[PDB]
Each structure stands twice: as C-alpha cells, then as structure tokens.
Amino acid sequence: EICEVSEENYIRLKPLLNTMIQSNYNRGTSAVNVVLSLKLVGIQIQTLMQKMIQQIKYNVKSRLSDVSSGELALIILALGVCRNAEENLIYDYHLIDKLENKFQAEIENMEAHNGTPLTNYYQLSLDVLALCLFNGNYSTAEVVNHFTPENKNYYFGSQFSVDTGAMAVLALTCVKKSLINGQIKADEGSLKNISIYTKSLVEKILSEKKENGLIGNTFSTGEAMQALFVSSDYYNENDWNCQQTLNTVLTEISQGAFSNPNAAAQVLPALMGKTFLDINKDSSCVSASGNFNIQSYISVNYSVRINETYFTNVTVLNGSVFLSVMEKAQKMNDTIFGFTMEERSWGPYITCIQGLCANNNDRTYWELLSGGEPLSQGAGSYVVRNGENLEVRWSKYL
Ligand code: CNC
Ligand SMILES: *[C@@H]1O[C@H](CO)[C@@H](O)[C@H](O)[C@H]1NC(C)=O
Ligand SMILES: *[C@@H]1O[C@H](CO)[C@@H](O)[C@H](O)[C@H]1NC(C)=O
Ligand SMILES: *[C@@H]1O[C@H](CO)[C@@H](O)[C@H](O)[C@H]1NC(C)=O
Ligand SMILES: *[C@@H]1O[C@H](CO)[C@@H](O)[C@H](O)[C@H]1NC(C)=O
Ligand SMILES: *[C@@H]1O[C@H](CO)[C@@H](O)[C@H](O)[C@H]1NC(C)=O
Ligand SMILES: *[C@@H]1O[C@H](CO)[C@@H](O)[C@H](O)[C@H]1NC(C)=O
Ligand SMILES: *[C@@H]1O[C@H](CO)[C@@H](O)[C@H](O)[C@H]1NC(C)=O
Ligand SMILES: [Ca+2]
C-alpha cells in the first residue's frame, strides 16, 4: 500500500522543511541527506544545494579515501535524483567507480573479520542501492551471499534493525527490477532467492510494528514505509494500515519529534509517497518546483555499566539533555565518568568512557538507556525527566 499526505495537509510537513533549512547554519551536519530528501519530493533549496556541493567538493578533493561507502552512496544518490548539471560530478569524479571499490572493501572486511563489514548493513544496502540505480558494477551473487535475512548484521543485540532491514529491502528491490529489466544479468534463480530475502525482511519489519502504527521507533518508520511501499507483494491490506502509520508520524512532527535534520530528511520522502526507487538518473528534474510562503532543577540515577557499575545522583536544570547529565558526572569524577565524544552529522556520539572506546570489528558500543530501555535519541537530544534511571552501557551487536 502507498499512502501520503494530502495537499490540504502539506502545512503539517512545514516543521520538517523548517528544520532542514536551519541546518544551513550547522557546519557539523550533512547537507547530502537533506538535499537528497528534498529533491526526491520535487523540492529544490538553493542554500542547502550550495552547502552540499561545497561538502562534496571538499570531501572529494581532500578526504575521499576516508569517506565511508555509505557516505559516498548518499552523495551519488543526492547528485543523481534527476538529470541536472550537478549530476555530472558523479561521472567527472568517477564516484560510481569509487563506490564499487569502497563496497568491495566492505566485502573483503567481512571475509577478513568474521562477517563484520567496515561499517554496517545499512550502508551496505545503501551501496547496492546506489550501484543498482546508476548501473554500477556489482555482483548479484555477492548480494545473495551476504543479504540473507538471518545474517547477524540485521540485528543490534536481540533487536532487529528496522532501518537496516528497510534499506536492504529497497536495495534488494532495485536489483529485482534491474533483473526483470535488461540492466543486469545473473545466475538463474537469483531473482527467486532475492525475493525470498525480501519476503522475510518484510515480515521482520512488520513484526516491529507498534500499536500506534509506528514501525520500529519514530525514526525508523519513514524508511520502513518506503520499504513497504515497494513490497506490497509480501503483505495484505490487513497486515498494515498505512494511514494510521502516516497519522501517527504527522502527530510526532507537530510535537517536534523531528527536530534533528537527519531524522527530518529520512522521514520526508515516504510522507509524500516517495521512495529511494523513484530516483530516475535519466531526467525527472522539474526545474519549477517549490513555492514557499514565509528555573527548577531535576535529579536522576545516572549509571555507567561495563562489567561493574558506577552510579551517582546528578542534578541538572530542567529541560537538560542526556549529555548534560554525563558532563556533570564527568566533573564530579573524571576517572569514572570521564568520557570521549565525537561530533557526527546526527550529533554528539559517545565513543569512549574511562578510556574504553567502542570498536567496530569487536562489534562493541556504548548504549544509552532509561529505565533499562534503549533511547531513541542521542545524548545531545534526549530530554531527561525527574527520577529517571539513566544508563550508559557497554554492549555488543551480538
Ligand atoms: C549502524 C547504526 C545506525 N544507527 Co544508531 C542505532 N540503532 N547505531 C548504529 C551503529 C553505529 C556503528 C556502526 N557500525 O556503524 C551502533 C549500533 C553502534 C548505533 C548506536 C546508536 N544508535 C542510536 C540511535 C537512537 C540511532 N541510530 C540510528 C542513527 C541508526 C541508523 C539508521 C538510520 N540512519 O536511520 C543506523 C542503522 C545506520 C547509520 C549509518 O551508517 N548511516 C549511513 C551513514 C552514511 O551516515 P552516518 O551519519 O555517517 O552514520 C554514522 C553515524 O550515524 C553514527 N551513528 C549511528 N547511530 C548514531 C546515533 C546518534 C545519536 C549519533 C549522534 C550518531 C550515530 O554511526 C554511523 C557510522 O559511523 C537511528 C536513526 C535508528 C533509530 N530509528 O532509532 C537513531 C537516531 C535517532 C535520533 N533522532 O537520534 C543510539 C543512541 C541507541 C542507544 N540507545 O544506545 C546509539 C548511540 C549511542 C552513542 N554511543 O552515542
Ligand atoms: C538460491 O538459493 C538456493 C537455496 O539456498 C540455492 O540452492 C541456489 O543455489 C540459489 N540460487 C542462486 C542462483 O543464487
Ligand atoms: C503567507 O504567510 C502569511 C504570514 O503572515 C499569512 O498571513 C498568509 O496568509 C500566507 N499566504 C498564503 C495564503 O500563502
Ligand atoms: C568484563 O569482564 C570479563 C570477565 O568476565 C573480562 O574478560 C572483560 O575484559 C570485561 N569487559 C571489559 C569491557 O573489559
Ligand atoms: C540506580 O542505579 C544503581 C546501579 O547503578 C542501582 O543500584 C540503584 O538501585 C538505582 N536507583 C534506583 C532507585 O533505581
Ligand atoms: C544526591 O543525593 C544525596 C543524598 O540524598 C544528596 O544529599 C545530595 O545533595 C545529592 N547530590 C547531588 C549532586 O544531586
Ligand atoms: C520541567 O519542565 C517540564 C516541561 O518543560 C515539565 O513537564 C516538568 O513538570 C517540569 N518539572 C517538574 C515539575 O518536574
Ligand atoms: C571517583 O570515585 C572513585 C570511586 O568511588 C573514588 O575512589 C575516587 O577517589 C574518585 N576519583 C576522583 C578523581 O575524585
Ligand atoms: Ca577525559
């Protein structure tokens, strides 16, 4: 099923639009995902477009080797949503060729490191999707080999990653269409296995549907909708009410749930009935598209769990974020609560605590929890409440 915001309710999407516009003033956040999101729904924003090109030219000319496969995949997707002058950058910089190498590096890392890629399966799916949409060279056998729904990389602990599953579905679906067309040849029976993979992934995605229509959490729903949009083969009308899901998301937007530009970007296309598969590299660019009218303190139980657990009661100003709690604890005791964070596009990411740093190959990371439940937001955004059992936990992907 495909549902979308009616033209009468377009005003409800304004907070998303506003959020993405403010990201112009944030040099730490990406413009690639934002511009991709906008162009996908037929929206062009000059300032953000200029920001993205600047970021792309910067990374290509002096950091291309360090750019992750998934990051390059998004760059290619953003530059080639439709045919324009900026799309030439893909072929002038040979980004598709570079993506093939980065994608192969992910594969060779899994062979060397017990099945763990350099990044993750979300990016791996982004890689296949981009290579598929832009006629890049990739092995379908490699896809059949690694994208099996039972693969551990679809799961973070015991939790199936809806985001990962959704992006995989979008990628696998592209390969399917490419196979049925004349774009790509493969060993006969590949279409069958990929279809089965997709079938299983759709079931796992729908199994994470909440009572309110959300699929996974608030921030995985948008791309989950995309995946379900293109995979109606594997579910009935009574397996999913798209309208309920849409309505719940719209409610979240009005409550400011999508204040993070990365989250706003990822949710937008589906709300307009669009998916990543609507990317037509051979022209869809409508040049005329877009007319825009324009003290109190609180206390929590903060704990750091590794094997043993260190805990204190911290007091912060009301409306403080999870990160503020961590910083207060660090001041109380740098030995025990001292941490290392890095600035990401999503925001502040916790890499190390007590000199103990998260490791990709070890499949280890720091997990944020409240009352034993994993947060849906980062430390920099999660507003804490009185009497909350806040916890940062050393965890595995399992
Ligand atoms: C892989 C993945 C992803 N993750 Co994590 C999950 N699950 N994540 C991870 C892993 C990262 C390491 C790895 N192997 O890459 C992993 C398992 C450790 C992780 C952890 C976290 N994640 C978290 C969450 C909530 C999110 N994650 C997603 C970004 C969720 C993603 C889904 C999505 N994007 O919609 C996701 C599936 C794909 C990210 C990616 O590669 N994108 C493509 C890439 C090209 O862009 P990128 O921006 O460079 O991606 C990098 C960063 O995003 C960073 N990163 C990953 N997650 C976060 C979360 C935050 C808050 C920040 C600031 C950075 C990150 O890791 C990526 C590789 O370096 C999220 C959209 C999933 C969701 N629907 O809830 C959500 C963001 C929501 C929001 N409004 O903030 C955690 C806070 C969960 C928790 N309760 O502990 C936690 C961060 C704790 C900390 N230390 O600060
Ligand atoms: C498809 O999967 C089946 C069952 O695992 C396997 O026997 C077969 O070799 C696969 N076919 C292709 C072309 O991948
Ligand atoms: C544009 O925004 C202004 C804000 O004052 C509003 O009054 C006006 O009705 C809007 N114009 C339309 C209808 O697009
Ligand atoms: C946790 O304890 C185990 C012993 O059971 C130890 O081997 C391991 O190093 C500890 N974990 C960390 C993160 O050091
Ligand atoms: C706070 O966390 C500690 C462990 O870190 C635990 O012993 C204590 O019971 C917690 N406080 C409450 C009331 O939940
Ligand atoms: C935490 O709790 C203790 C005991 O109730 C209290 O005396 C102290 O003021 C609190 N400390 C902080 C930093 O909140
Ligand atoms: C702090 O502010 C929040 C909303 O801003 C409010 O819900 C909460 O009640 C306030 N502090 C109290 C009374 O615990
Ligand atoms: C921090 O807490 C630990 C554990 O109670 C304590 O032994 C140590 O003296 C403290 N370190 C600092 C830097 O205050
Ligand atoms: Ca330190």
Swiss-Prot record:
Segment Globular N-terminal alpha domain: which positions?
Answer: 1-287
Positions bound to cyanocob(III)alamin: 119-123, 163, 217, 266, 349-350, 366-368, 375, 397
Q: Secreted: is it a keyword of this entry? A: yes
UniProt keyword Ribosomal protein present: no
Q: In which tissues is it expressed?
A: Produced by the salivary glands of the oral cavity, in response to ingestion of food. Major constituent of secondary granules in neutrophils.
Q: Show the segment(s) annotated as Globular C-terminal beta domain.
A: 297-397
- Post-translational changes noted in the entry: Contains about 30% carbohydrates.
Q: Which InterPro entries match?
A: Cbl-bd_prot (IPR002157), Cobalamin_Transport (IPR051588), Transcobalamin-like_C (IPR027954)
Attached carbohydrates are found at 137, 193, 293, 301, 307, 313, 318, 333
Keyword set for this entry?
Cobalt, Cobalt transport, Disulfide bond, Glycoprotein, Ion transport, Secreted, Signal, Transport
Gene Ontology biological process terms, A to Z: cobalamin transport; cobalt ion transport
Entry's Gene Ontology molecular function annotations: cargo receptor ligand activity; cobalamin binding; molecular sequestering activity
The superkingdom of the source organism is Eukaryota
Q: Name one GO cellular component term.
A: extracellular region
Which pairs of positions does the record mark as disulfide bonds? 3-242, 82-285, 132-174, 352-357
Q: Where in the cell is it found?
A: Secreted
Say which family it is in: Belongs to the eukaryotic cobalamin transport proteins family.
Role of this protein: Binds vitamin B12 with femtomolar affinity and protects it from the acidic environment of the stomach.
Q: Which protein are we looking at?
A: Transcobalamin-1
